[PDB]
Structure formats: structure tokens, C-alpha cells
């Protein structure tokens, strides 16, 4: 039931997304053992992802949250890197796309730092990099995001350096704590809380 539609450079809607990708990349504290390195990226492509059943079902669950939090979905714009992406956005998120291990709990992580996306785009760690030269810093190779609107409710702050919610929360928000440059990091408990609004494909750029 999925229909990408490409977005044309000229679009605003394509750059308002290019923008949030670009502005959002950091420096990581593994000197780019992850996800490379890199500050900037190549955006090769902004597809829109439609699929009237997945939609739907975000926004049941968006009502839903929204009833239980004063008409309040705290509805956020935040990217997914995961090996998973081309299921997710024909499947929708389920608890097969979270990461079992994560600070927070098994549960499905999202980034406002697209660079912290980025690292788990060939896996966790960047696994072993991209298929083809097993770089998890590849400057050649294609690599995909999701930009997604995720709604959070009511979230836990946690501040720090599947499962369910914490009682009485929708989501978990971590709070960077320790590195100052660091935007926060969120988790949610059920795949209907988050859509794949938009796939980018892109590479990273060597600096100069
Ligand atoms: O790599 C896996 N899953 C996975 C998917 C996404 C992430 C992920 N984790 C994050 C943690 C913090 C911030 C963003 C993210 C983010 O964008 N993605 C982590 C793990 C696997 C599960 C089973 C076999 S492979
Ligand atoms: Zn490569």
C-alpha cells in the first residue's frame, strides 16, 4: 500500500526537510567510529512516503495519546536510521524495528541529531559499515533516513550522560546531560506512534 513520491529540489517541502538534515548534524564522542565522518551530507534524494493504512493508524493512536495529555499529542519531526528502513516503510514500525538494548529500554529511538541516526544506519555501532566496503565511514555508498512524525504524550525526562512506557508516560525523552552540543534522543514503546513521513537518501561528505 506504499507510494514514494519524490520531492523536487525546488520544493520548499524539499528543503525545509534538506535544511533540518544539514542543521542538525554534530560531532559525536566517537570521533566517528559509528556512523563516519563527516559535516555534511550529499542529499541525493527526499521522498514522500504514503500509505493510507499506516497513516491511519498513527493517527488512532495520536487521538488516543492526545485525550489522555489535554488534547496534547506533543507531536515532534525526527529522523530513524535503522537497517530496517525499507520495511518500515511498507510494514510501519512494530516492536521488531526497537533496539533491545538501548539506555532507555527496548523500544523504537528517534534522533533530533540526524548524525545520531546516521550511526545506525548500517546497524548498532554502524555494524560492520556499508555492504559493499565494510566502511562505516563510506563516502561512495548510498545511505537512507526517515524523517518521521512521532508522537511522544506525556514523556519521562530522562537525563543521562519491547518494553512498555514508564507508568502514567507515552514516551521517553533523554536529556543530554554531559555534552553540551547534544540534542535530545526520544523512545517510544509502540510502533503506532510514529509515521515515516519522509525517506532521504543521501551520502556523507569527506571534509574538506
Ligand atoms: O539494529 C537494529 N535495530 C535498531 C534500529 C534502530 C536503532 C536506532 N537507535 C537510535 C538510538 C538513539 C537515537 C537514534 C536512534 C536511531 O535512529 N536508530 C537501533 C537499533 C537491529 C535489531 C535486530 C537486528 S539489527
Ligand atoms: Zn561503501
Same mark, same amino acid.
Given at each position: 500500500?506504499?507510494?514514494?513520491?519524490?520531492?523536487?529540489?525546488?520544493?520548499?517541502?524539499?528543503?525545509?526537510?534538506?535544511?533540518?538534515?544539514?542543521?542538525?548534524?554534530?560531532?559525536?564522542?566517537?570521533?566517528?567510529?559509528?556512523?563516519?565522518?563527516?559535516?555534511?551530507?550529499?542529499?541525493?534524494?527526499?521522498?514522500?512516503?504514503?500509505?493510507?493504512?499506516?497513516?491511519?493508524?498513527?493517527?488512532?493512536?495520536?487521538?488516543? +495519546?492526545?485525550?489522555?495529555? *489535554?488534547?496534547?499529542?506533543? $507531536? @515532534?519531526?525526527?529522523?530513524? =536510521?535503522?537497517? &530496517? +528502513?525499507?520495511?518500515?516503510? *511498507?510494514?510501519?514500525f512494530? $516492536? @521488531?524495528?526497537?533496539?533491545? =538494548?538501548?539506555? &532507555?529500554?527496548?523500544?523504537?529511538?528517534?534522533?533530533?541529531?540526524?548524525?545520531?541516526?546516521?550511526?545506525?544506519?548500517?546497524?548498532?555501532?554502524?555494524?560492520?559499515?556499508?555492504?559493499?566496503?565494510?566502511?562505516?565511514?563510506?563516502?561512495?555508498?548510498?545511505?537512507?533516513?526517515?524523517?518521521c512524525?512521532v508522537?511522544?504524550?506525556?514523556?519521562?525526562?530522562?537525563?543521562?550522560?519491547?518494553?512498555?512506557?514508564?507508568?502514567?508516560?507515552?514516551?521517553?525523552?533523554?536529556?543530554?546531560?554531559?555534552?553540551?552540543?547534544?540534542?535530545?534522543?526520544?523512545?517510544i514503546?509502540?510502533?503506532?506512534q510514529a509515521y515515516?513521513?519522509?525517506?532521504?537518501?543521501?551520502?556523507?561528505?569527506?571534509?574538506?
Amino acid at each position: 500500500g506504499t507510494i514514494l513520491i519524490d520531492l523536487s529540489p525546488d520544493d520548499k517541502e524539499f528543503q525545509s526537510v534538506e535544511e533540518e538534515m544539514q542543521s542538525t548534524v554534530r560531532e559525536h564522542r566517537d570521533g566517528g567510529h559509528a556512523g563516519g565522518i563527516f559535516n555534511r551530507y550529499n542529499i541525493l534524494k527526499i521522498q514522500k512516503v504514503c500509505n493510507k493504512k499506516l497513516w491511519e493508524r498513527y493517527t488512532h493512536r495520536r487521538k488516543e +495519546v492526545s485525550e489522555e495529555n *489535554h488534547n496534547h499529542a506533543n $507531536e @515532534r519531526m525526527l529522523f530513524h =536510521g535503522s537497517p &530496517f +528502513v525499507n520495511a518500515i516503510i *511498507h510494514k510501519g514500525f512494530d $516492536e @521488531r524495528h526497537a533496539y533491545i =538494548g538501548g539506555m &532507555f529500554g527496548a523500544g523504537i529511538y528517534f534522533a533530533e541529531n540526524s548524525s545520531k541516526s546516521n550511526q545506525y544506519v548500517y546497524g548498532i555501532g554502524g555494524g560492520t559499515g556499508c555492504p559493499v566496503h565494510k566502511d562505516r565511514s563510506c563516502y561512495i555508498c548510498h545511505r537512507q533516513l526517515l524523517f518521521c512524525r512521532v508522537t511522544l504524550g506525556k514523556s519521562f525526562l530522562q537525563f543521562s550522560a519491547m518494553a512498555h512506557s514508564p507508568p502514567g508516560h507515552h514516551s521517553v525523552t533523554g536529556r543530554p546531560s554531559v555534552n553540551g552540543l547534544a540534542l535530545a534522543e526520544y523512545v517510544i514503546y509502540r510502533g503506532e506512534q510514529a509515521y515515516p513521513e519522509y525517506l532521504i537518501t543521501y551520502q556523507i561528505m569527506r571534509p574538506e
